[model samples]
Structure formats: C-alpha cells, structure tokens
Target: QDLPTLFYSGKSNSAVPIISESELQTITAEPWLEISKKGLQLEGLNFDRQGQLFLLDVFEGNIFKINPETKEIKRPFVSHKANPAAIKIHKDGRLFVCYLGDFKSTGGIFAATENGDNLQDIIEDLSTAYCIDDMVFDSKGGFYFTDFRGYSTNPLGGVYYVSPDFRTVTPIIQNISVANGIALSTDEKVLWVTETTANRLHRIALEDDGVTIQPFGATIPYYFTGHEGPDSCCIDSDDNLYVAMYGQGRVLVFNKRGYPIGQILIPGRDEGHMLRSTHPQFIPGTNQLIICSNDIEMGGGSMLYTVNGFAKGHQSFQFQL
Candidate 1:
C-alpha cells in the first residue's frame, strides 16, 4: 500500500480506526474492523513469511493471527498474566515472545513453534525489575533486546544481548535512560537501541561473542522534536531504522548512520490517542512496512498500520547454533 492505513478497535467512543496513509496525514481514516466484541486488546503486530499478520493484546495476553486479505482473525496463543509486549518470527519457524512483566518485578522471554500453542520460557530470572521492551535476532541466531526500566521515577536502563546458545546474557549499554526498542543493521554489525525517557537512540558495535560492545552514536536529531517518544523499531533493507513514536502519533525513519530521513504522522485525534506505536516490521518482496499502534484507554485495543517506500526485502541472516 503506497499510503498507510489505520485499524481501530470499536469499543469506546474512542476506538481503534483504520485510516489510509493520505487520511493519516489529515487524521481521517475510518475503522477497518470493530473488535471490541472479541474481548481482545490488540497491541504488538508482525507478519510471517507467508504474509500472515500476527498481533498481541497487551491487556488480555492473547496472540491473534489475522489474514490481511480476508480480515479473518483467530486466537492462536495466550499468556495468562505475562503481558506480551513484542514478538519476532524466527527463521526456524519459532516465535520469540517478550513479556512486559510487572514493572516492579522481573520480566522474561519465551520461544515457541510457529503454531506456538504452548510457548515455553527461555529466560526466566531477570533481576533488574525491567520489562523486555523489544528484540531482534542477529544473523547468527543471537538476540539483542531492550530493557525498559524506570517507568515512574528514575530513567535508567540498559540493552542486553543473548547468545544463540542461550548460555549467556550480557549488557551492551549500561546506565542509560529507559532503553526501549532494539534493532540490528542489515550487516548485523551495528546495533540500535532507543532511550525512551531521554528521547535518544544509541548505536553500538556488536562483538563476535556478544560480550563487548562499542558505542558509536547517541541521540539522532528529531525531525519534529518534543512531540513524541521513540518506542520500538525495525531495520529496512537499506539499513534504515523505522521507529514508532509513542505519544506523537507517527513513525520516524532514520538513515543507517542515524540521520533523520522522513516521518509518517498518523491522522486522528479521536482514535483513543496514540499511546505507543511499535513493532515496525518490513515485509518481504515489497516496500511495505507494518506497525502496531497502541492507544491510551486502559482496555482500548491497538491497531496495525502499513506504508510503502521501503526497499525490497532480502533474506535475513540467523545466528548459527
């Protein structure tokens, strides 16, 4: 789709609405589906290799599979109280689930098969009392994730890398302010992590063993400053980072070297007010980008948005076992 579209949850006076990219400019797109009756609070969104879109409801803890063409929705997995925040489809047909556990308690990461009816915890004992915000797997199977800490008071958090063998978890950047989203360069050499509170994005060099990290840059200039907070992100074919801006109602595109390129502002002041736009996934074989926009109301559901202009997709590398 050349233009981006918004999907709304028809629950309250302010429900999730699906608007076109052009209408997004003026904030006038309408709701594609009214899912309030389903009792799902859709949040995170991503696409699989076969073009099936998967989404998570943060409050309800349910993962839904949707057919983009037919708009068929089905619940494939559920987490009782984990509060799944982000998800990634692995090359091996497994899904990696990140939990936004209780902010005052430790969080976790889980892995499951494509069907994923029974997901198992991969990392259980996180001591920092930080939730797993977002994650991206490296070419060699190793995963890099963000630890978003200090939701109410102190803005201090870190980014960490988990080895492919699942034997080691090491911090990449430390003493930062609420590291939220994470993405790896196409070449898997550079790492990008967002500092939600500070409103900055940090770039780091990835070492072979996932032990050492070198900081390259921090905080790229914002195209329209002071409007939103950078939440989650994904890398395009050209290595550009597409970030979801929470509270600002838009997605900011950044060059491989961390330079502002463009922005896609969502249209709609009545659609529950954008809370956190996240999980920007670049689709394969096309220039399309998929995102999940979480709104403000407590039980208010999330919406999926898509836009064109990205480069053609290429096979991403997976870390070797």
Candidate 2:
C-alpha cells in the first residue's frame, strides 16, 4: 500500500524484451510502474462490478484481463479485426469498441461480449475517413465520443452522442479544433470535453437525461502557462479531475472550478520524449491511477503507469467477471 508498485512482478519474462533506460530518459521525478507490453497501448480499464481490471491494445488490437489478486495478464480475448483507439464497457455487459475505420473510407464504434464473443458493429461510416478517440458513458446507458486529429483544426472536429437506445450518433458539439477525451461530472450533469489543439477544456450543461445539451459556456483555460492541454481524464469521488497532460510530464489535478490543485509529474518515456499520457482510469476500489503513457515522438506503443492519488476514481459498471 506504499504506492503504485509492480504488481505484475510475475510479468511474463516472455514479453519481447523492452529497453529500460535510466530515470533521466523520462521527465518525471517519481518512480512509476512501467508495463511490459509496449508499442501502442490505449484504453481498456472500465472496472467490472467485481472490481476486476481489463485492457485494450490500441495498436495490437488485443483485449486483456488483469487479475485482481495476482495482477496476471490474459489475452484470451483478441480483436484482430479492429484498430482500437478506446474501450469502455456498458452497464448491460457490452463492451463498446472505438477504432479507426477498417478502411480509409470509414471509422466508428462497435461492441462485443466480455469474452470477446458476439461481436457487433454498433456504428460505422461516420467519418468518411477518421479516428474515434476517447469515450465515456452516463448512468442512463448513453455515451459520448470524440473525433479527429488532423481534421480537428480544419474546423471539422466533433463530439458525438450515442442515444441510450444505440440507434444514432448525433453531434451535439461540432467544429471543434481537436476533440480528445470525454467524461461526466460527479453528478453527471456536465459534459467534459478535452480539446487538444485549442488547449482548453470545454463544458456543456446536460439535462438530467445526460444527453440533451443546455447551451454553451465559456471555454475553460486549464493547464499551466505554456503547457499542452489534457489528452484524457477521469473524475474522483471528491469531483477532482486527474488529467493526462499531453506534452508535460505530469498528471494535472484540478478542482471542479478548473483551478490547479495538484499534479503528478511523470518522467519522459524510454526515448526521452515528452510524456504523452492518454486515458487516465482509476483502479477500482482504490485511490490509485492507471494511465496509458508513452512517447508519440518515437512512434512508440503505450505503457501503463500507476500513480497513487488522494481519492478513489469514478466507477463504471463493472462486469461480474
């Protein structure tokens, strides 16, 4: 309980030997748990009702289960069919998969069962040619996701909402300069969208139903002066926001009012590039952070790092598994 340590001490030595460098390689001032699987890790940590952890390989297209006790890793569920960018499980036992369209002409969301069976294409062809990044769901079974990297600044980026019935993907907010992460407030009344290029966090007031937009609010100027905006984030029980600061080697913590309260400055990656930490999901039942971290400059895959936090993270409906 000291801090986030190598729970995966039994990490398969079989892992393709990764190169480990000195702490100087990264920008962080603290020791962090470096995962064995490298090269492009994304999202997968929506804890089940049982508090078990799972993961998605954004680059390799594989699904894994992390044992709660042994911290062992399993890849029994692999999705060679997708180029996943993010993964969040539904309250009804469906795992929603977001990925780049299989072809240059498409990109959307899909889903499958806990065991990787019963695959279903939820939505496709929304992008003509785009990538769906982060996703978050509210209590009503409805969800939201972001789109675009290059096309964002073209005034074409957007944030889409999936009706609770899963019948349509509607754009409540469009023409964003770079729509990245998605999450709900502690009460699920406000929608948080992390805009990368804009270097700001935009909020939309949502109705009790969690989808109907109330109106526009001022674009919140977050992050330290001259630092890149957040890439992804999760809310703590106290309504604190733990964000994956893109260029800065730190997890920027902010109060609900958008003021910096604290931060966790991680070091650079194995290649010494500024830390590019993506999805920040809290480990179930604990005040620790499990984030997808790596260096985009080196075209490297992601590494999962756990950082101890002040409070427990938001809990999604975890599967009984």
Candidate 3:
C-alpha cells in the first residue's frame, strides 16, 4: 500500500537519532475540570510569575490555569468564539494572547489582566499577514511572532517584530510556508522560526542596526521529513532547542550547532492516544518540560506530558522586565 503523498513526502538530512528511550517519561491523568465535550486542542503552554502553567483551549475558546505542584486546573477566562491559540505573560503582569482568527483576515494579538480580565485590543490590524500563531518576548521588551501562511508548495508565510510600546509592527522575515514556532537565542542575537508546512527550521541572525530588517543570511539549521511537522519550540539555558513534533508524540532536541542531540517521546504513543503534541514549555526555574498534546478519541482529550531533567530554560524578558 502506498502512503499518501503528503504522508511520506517529507525529507531531512539533518536528523541523527541519539537520544535513548529510557531517559524519556510521560505523565498523564484526568483533568480536574470536566471533559464532557470534545475537540480539545490545547496550546500556548506558558507560565506566569507565580510559576503556574497557563494554556489555551482552542476549540472551547477558554484560558486555563494549572498549578504545577497540585495539578489543580481552573478555567480563568473564556472568550467564546474568538479562537485563542498562543498566550504569553508580559513583564508588566499582563497576559498577551494571539488568535488564529479563522485563518483569514481576523486574527490578531490582544492583552488581558492576570485574572483574564480587561481584554483589550493590542495589534488588531495586521495589514497583509495571514494569521497569528506563536510569539516570544525579547529582552528589550518587544516580541516576535509568526504570520502563519502558506503550505508545502506555497511560501506565503512570514515573521514580524512588534515594538515594546505596541506602536509599530515590522515584517522581519518573508516568504515562509506556515512559519509556526518562533523563539529567540540565548543571547538574543538570533531568531528561530519553524516552517511547519515544509518541515524546516530557519535561523535568522539579527544585525547590529535595530531598524534594518535584514532577511539575508537566513539559514535552515534543521529539517524534518515527517507528516506531523514541528510546531511550537522552546530554548533551554544551554542553548538547546526542544521542538514539539506535532502528531508524532515527540519533542525533538537540537544543540546550538543544530545537531540532533536527543528527543522526548510520549508514553503509549504507539497505542494511538495522546499523539498530537503541539507545544513544549519549560517550567520556570525548573528542568521539567511540560508538553501540551491531544489524544485519539471521538471527541478528543488533552494531556500535559512532562519530560524531566534538562538544562534550565533561557530566561524570558518577562522574568526581568
């Protein structure tokens, strides 16, 4: 039987398997909240100043807070029908969230209080960018986000830079296919954007000038020839990248030199449950990486799988600013 064209079409010469399966561990349990419904797509796995994990329920249009210690989950807020996707906490004690917005001309960034109150429009007018997917805060108070566009053959996606003051938005990198996971280097001198549709990860070295959006010299450090593709990614203190491989139930690891060091795989992945791992976020001041993923069921279910013992996570701007 021939695998579908899209299923077996991906190719990558950069992948070298090194990590052992024993070092990986998967944690799963029933959520404290009710899961009576289906279509549970969990994303935007981030932590607040209090070290609590906050993520978005895409289908339910809800923001949920979880205590990493007690595992007590609570729904702090809900924006019905808005399609919230990615979320990050600001240094000023506010939550910044991005919406997928029907993948048309609807999605943009918004801000809210810690308790999920005061939802205000921050960047509602993305002139030509398709949709908001993922974002990371910079040391200087600004942030970078990906404009999710394009597919395997169409390179219509791009990346953008938003000023800290929320006054300007500049397109930094262009012509990418579904630029998904966006992260910054440890030194803040480099930016990483994942081309999910093409199964490639690009590194953009920042220039000296602040205003010059140099799209030159960009390099694809890693590529995955898989149907699932890389989704959201995070950086560790030692400059290692933990990229969540969507639909593969794994998080691929790479070092600063772009070498495939190791990987973390979810438990029971072969049994056909909890395979849609979307995002990987390290617990602040800890080495545990909590991954948000969904399962294979009628209505669907989500889980937070933890991969323990890694270098500390790179401090984000919110931690200091």
User: Judged by lDDT, which candidate is best?
Assistant: 3
Task: Assess candidate 1 and give its lDDT.
Answer: 0.64
lDDT of 2 at 311: 75
Please list the C-alpha lDDT of all candidates, in the order they appear.
0.64, 0.64, 0.73
lDDT of 3 by residue, 1-321 (tens): 121111101121224434333432223322233222455888898888888888987767788888877878888888643677798889887888878777765778888986767878777835544578888988777889888766889887888888889888888888888888988888877788888889998888887643354567588877775667889998888777778888777777666656566566766677766677788887899766777777744345667766553477777866884
Per-residue lDDT of model 1, residues 28-53, tens digit only: 22234433443344555567777777
The parts of candidate 3 lying over 4 Å away from their true place are 1-39, 125-128, 210-216, 296-300
Error of 2 at 179 (Å): 1.0
What TM-score number comes out for model 2?
A: 0.80
Clashes of 3: 1
Q: Is candidate 1 or candidate 3 better by lDDT?
A: 3
- Residue ranges of candidate 1 with Cα displaced over 4 Å: 2-41, 125-130, 151-153, 208-210, 215-224, 270-272, 298-301, 317-321
